[PDB]
């Protein structure tokens, strides 16, 4: 799941963009998890969040995405 | 001018209607578009524009039919287009009331189809003379 969501943000950024409601159901629990420090618990490229601010952050606040994240 | 420009590009397309395989003539068009590419850059940055209706809640600073030329002065500019064309955009706002920026009257600069036309021209140039560098 970790790889899943992470690669999703890596290319799609759905929480930056194509966010779920109760529709796109899986993601409803998954919204909250990104907020946590420890989201990348075991992906062994556990730094992805900063790549996410690196890519989707320019479209928005660089720290507003960090408001979402770091 | 928009009209003229539209039909203009139309002829340019009508020229390409005969083209299919790596057409010599289409390539010469490419070459002129190389020479005039400055101008294409100009018109296209004009095509970057109705875009500004996005500005009225993404970076709102009043939402009462009026907004200061500052939150949108460093919004979308703060991530591509030269700010010279943002100051050009202040004139496009025609200084509404005073510092404040007008909304929907921005959206008219209609011309939409022109951009479709050139786009078609481009995308078709990509096809008329396939598997090539300077073109792409």
Swiss-Prot record, chain A:
Binding site for caffeine: 44
Residues of the full protein shown: 4673 to 4742 of 5037
Domain characteristics, as noted in the entry: The calcium release channel activity resides in the C-terminal region while the remaining part of the protein constitutes the 'foot' structure spanning the junctional gap between the sarcoplasmic reticulum (SR) and the T-tubule. Pore opening is mediated via the cytoplasmic calcium-binding domains that mediate a small rotation of the channel-forming transmembrane regions that then leads to channel opening.
Signal sequence interval, chain numbering: none
Family designation: Belongs to the ryanodine receptor (TC 1.A.3.1) family. RYR1 subfamily.
Superkingdom as given in the UniProt entry: Eukaryota
PTM summary: The N-terminus is blocked. Channel activity is modulated by phosphorylation.
Note: Binding of [3H]ryanodine indicates that the heterozygous channel is activated by Ca(2+) concentrations 4-fold lower than normal. Single-cell analysis of cotransfected cells shows a significantly increased resting cytoplasmic Ca(2+) level and a significantly reduced luminal Ca(2+) level.
Lineage of the species this protein comes from: Eukaryota, Metazoa, Chordata, Craniata, Vertebrata
Protein name as annotated: Ryanodine receptor 1
Curated annotation (Swiss-Prot), chain B:
Location(s) in or outside the cell: Sarcoplasmic reticulum membrane
Tissues in which the UniProt entry reports expression: Detected in skeletal muscle (at protein level). Fast- or slow-twitch skeletal muscle.
PTM annotation, UniProt: The N-terminus is blocked. Channel activity is modulated by phosphorylation.
Ranges for domain EF-hand: 54-81
Superkingdom as given in the UniProt entry: Eukaryota
Family classification: Belongs to the ryanodine receptor (TC 1.A.3.1) family. RYR1 subfamily.
Entry comment, domain topic: The calcium release channel activity resides in the C-terminal region while the remaining part of the protein constitutes the 'foot' structure spanning the junctional gap between the sarcoplasmic reticulum (SR) and the T-tubule. Pore opening is mediated via the cytoplasmic calcium-binding domains that mediate a small rotation of the channel-forming transmembrane regions that then leads to channel opening.
More info: Binding of [3H]ryanodine indicates that the heterozygous channel is activated by Ca(2+) concentrations 4-fold lower than normal. Single-cell analysis of cotransfected cells shows a significantly increased resting cytoplasmic Ca(2+) level and a significantly reduced luminal Ca(2+) level.
Summary of subunit composition and partner proteins: Homotetramer. Can also form heterotetramers with RYR2. Identified in a complex composed of RYR1, PDE4D, PKA, FKBP1A and protein phosphatase 1 (PP1). Repeated very high-level exercise decreases interaction with PDE4D and protein phosphatase 1 (PP1). Interacts with CALM; CALM with bound calcium inhibits the RYR1 channel activity. Interacts with S100A1. Interacts with FKBP1A; this stabilizes the closed conformation of the channel. Interacts with CACNA1S; interaction with CACNA1S is important for activation of the RYR1 channel. Interacts with CACNB1.
Function: Cytosolic calcium-activated calcium channel that mediates the release of Ca(2+) from the sarcoplasmic reticulum into the cytosol and thereby plays a key role in triggering muscle contraction following depolarization of T-tubules. Repeated very high-level exercise increases the open probability of the channel and leads to Ca(2+) leaking into the cytoplasm. Can also mediate the release of Ca(2+) from intracellular stores in neurons, and may thereby promote prolonged Ca(2+) signaling in the brain. Required for normal embryonic development of muscle fibers and skeletal muscle.
Protein name per its UniProtKB record: Ryanodine receptor 1
Gene: RYR1
Portion of the parent chain present: 4016 to 4161 of 5037
């Amino acid at each position: 799941r970790e790889k899943e969501l992470a690669r999703k943000l890596e290319f799609d950024g759905l929480y930056i963009t194509e966010q779920p409601g109760d529709d796109d159901v899986k993601g409803q629990w998954d919204r909250l998890v990104l907020n946590t420090p420890s989201f990348p618990s075991n992906y062994w490229d556990k730094f992805v969040k900063r790549k996410v601010l690196d890519k989707h952050g320019d479209i928005f606040g660089r720290e507003r995405i960090a408001e979402l994240l770091g | 001018l928009l009209d003229l420009q539209k039909d203009m590009v139309v002829m340019l397309l009508s020229l390409l209607e005969g083209n299919v395989v790596n057409g010599m003539i289409a390539r010469q068009m490419v070459d002129m578009l190389v020479e005039s590419s400055s101008n294409v850059e100009m018109i296209l940055k004009f095509f970057d524009m109705i875009v500004g209706s996005e500005a009225f809640q993404d970076y709102v600073t009043d939402p009462r039919g009026l907004i200061s030329k500052k939150d949108f002065q460093k919004a979308m500019d703060s991530q591509q287009f030269t700010g010279p064309e943002i100051q050009f955009l202040l004139s496009c706002s025609e200084a509404d009331e005073n510092e404040m920026i007008n909304f929907e009257e921005f959206a008219n600069r209609p011309a939409r189809d022109i951009g479709f036309n050139v786009a078609v021209l481009l995308t078709n140039l990509s096809e008329h003379v396939p598997h090539d560098p300077r073109l792409r």
